[PDB]
Amino acid sequence: SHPVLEKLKAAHSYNPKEFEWNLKSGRVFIIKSYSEDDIHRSIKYSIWCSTEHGNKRLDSAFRCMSSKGPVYLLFSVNGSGHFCGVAEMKSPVDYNKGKFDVQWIFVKDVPNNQLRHIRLENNDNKPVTNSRDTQEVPLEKAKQVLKIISSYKHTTSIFDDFAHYEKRQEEEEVVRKERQSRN
């Protein structure tokens, strides 16, 4: 067990046994992450950043949902074949690129084969697992997705490789510093 991961787990209740997937109101979006390193950083710092267009869509949705219901984000790394968790969006986008606060709720790997029966009528009836970044999920389909993610008995999560990702970040920082030093 990594000491940083222990601090995180003491400060956050991940994978809560009591999650309300039967949302009365809300908006739910797919997040397609470029890498596991970004997921790891997001969990560590409770922040996310989409593209310029994605940030615009999420910023608008959050501001339109103020005091009406939550905005949930369903995370999957491009090409990974499985969703890796769920966070709630907690702030509008701050442009000093941008960034917004997130509160991670589920940190767990859910294979796409467990979700691909759910099709999005607002994305040409494609499986929810075939979505682009910031695709909005209609609420009833989002309930089905959240029910499965919340109940799934996962065998892995990104936390299994926590030390690995910590090392990746530290070493890259060293490399970056040295590169900057030489210029």
Curated annotation (Swiss-Prot):
Changing D38N: Increased binding to N6-methyladenosine (m6A)-containing RNAs. It is found in: Cytoplasm; Cytoplasm, P-body; Cytoplasm, Stress granule. Residues 26-149 form the YTH domain. It comes from the Eukaryota. RNA binds at K32, S33, Y34, D38, W48, C49, N78. Ubiquitinated by the CUL7-FBXW8 E3 ligase complex leading to degradation. Deubiquitinated and stabilized by USP5 by removing 'Lys-11'-linked polyubiquitination. Disulfide bonds: none annotated. The disordered regions have the ability to interact with each other and to 'phase separate' into liquid droplets within the cytosol following binding to mRNAs containing multiple m6A-modified residues. This leads to the partition of m6A-containing mRNAs into membraneless compartments, where mRNAs may be stored, degraded or used to transport mRNAs to dendritic arbors in neurons. Belongs to the YTHDF family. YTHDF1 subfamily. Specifically recognizes and binds N6-methyladenosine (m6A)-containing mRNAs, and regulates their stability. M6A is a modification present at internal sites of mRNAs and some non-coding RNAs and plays a role in mRNA stability and processing. Acts as a regulator of mRNA stability by promoting degradation of m6A-containing mRNAs via interaction with the CCR4-NOT complex. The YTHDF paralogs (YTHDF1, YTHDF2 and YTHDF3) shares m6A-containing mRNAs targets and act redundantly to mediate mRNA degradation and cellular differentiation. Interacts with CNOT1; promoting recruitment of the CCR4-NOT complex. Interacts with ribosomes. Interacts with eIF3 (EIF3A or EIF3B). Interacts with YTHDF3. This is YTH domain-containing family protein 1. It comes from Homo sapiens. The chain holds residues 364 to 557 of 559 of the full protein.
